[PDB]
Amino acid sequence: MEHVAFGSEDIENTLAKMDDGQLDGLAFGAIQLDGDGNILQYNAAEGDITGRDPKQVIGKNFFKDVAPCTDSPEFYGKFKEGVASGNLNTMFEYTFDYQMTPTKVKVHMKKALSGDSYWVFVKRV
């Protein structure tokens, strides 16, 4: 495993060193999106939670194609405001329910260290 704790204050510095292989070693779901919501990275733990095959979702739009239940002011809305502002750091509970058994999760979104990428971290609650 990669020892990083969900919600950690410096998580963005830590995850900057990890490759797709490394990211698959996290205790939680990790997704990296560009400013337009396209999926740059998607780790194994997210695949375990949502049932999606990580390889198949990279390159797709998260809010439009892959995860339309997140297309709402309460999820996508916070994302777009953070991208516009160039600053994002929010944590909230949410229910994933698209093509899958409803699953309650904790979501943490944070701007990355590179200029126009953004993390979505997810774990069960």
Ligand X SMILES: *C(=O)/C=C\c1ccc(O)cc1
Q: Which is nearer to ligand X, 53 or 81 (CB)?
A: 53
Least Cα distance to 113 among 8, 32, 59 occurs for 32
Query: Going by C-beta distance under 8 Å and a sequence separation of 6 or more, which residues neighbour residue 93?
Result: 104, 105, 106, 107, 125
CB neighbours (10 Å) of residue 36? 12
Query: Going by C-beta distance under 8 Å and a sequence separation of 6 or more, which residues neighbour residue 18?
Result: 2
Q: Does 26 bind ligand X (CB under 6 A)?
A: no
Residue nearest to ligand X (CB): 69
Q: Which is nearer to ligand X, 25 or 68 (CB)?
A: 68
Q: Which is nearer to ligand X, 13 or 27 (CB)?
A: 27
Q: Pick from 28, 76, 79, 96: which binds ligand X (CB under 6 A)?
A: 96
**Token pair 């944070």 is at which residue?**
110
Q: Pick from 18, 40, 58, 69: which binds ligand X (CB under 6 A)?
A: 69
Fill in the amino acid letter for 120: V
**Span from 3-11, 19-27, 68-76, 106-114 in contact with ligand X (CB under 6 A):** 68-76
| Residue 59 main-chain phi, psi, to 5 deg | 100, -10
Count the residues of the shown chain that bind ligand X, applying the rule CB under 6 A: 12
Site of interaction with ligand X (CB under 6 A): 46, 50, 52, 66-70, 96-98, 100
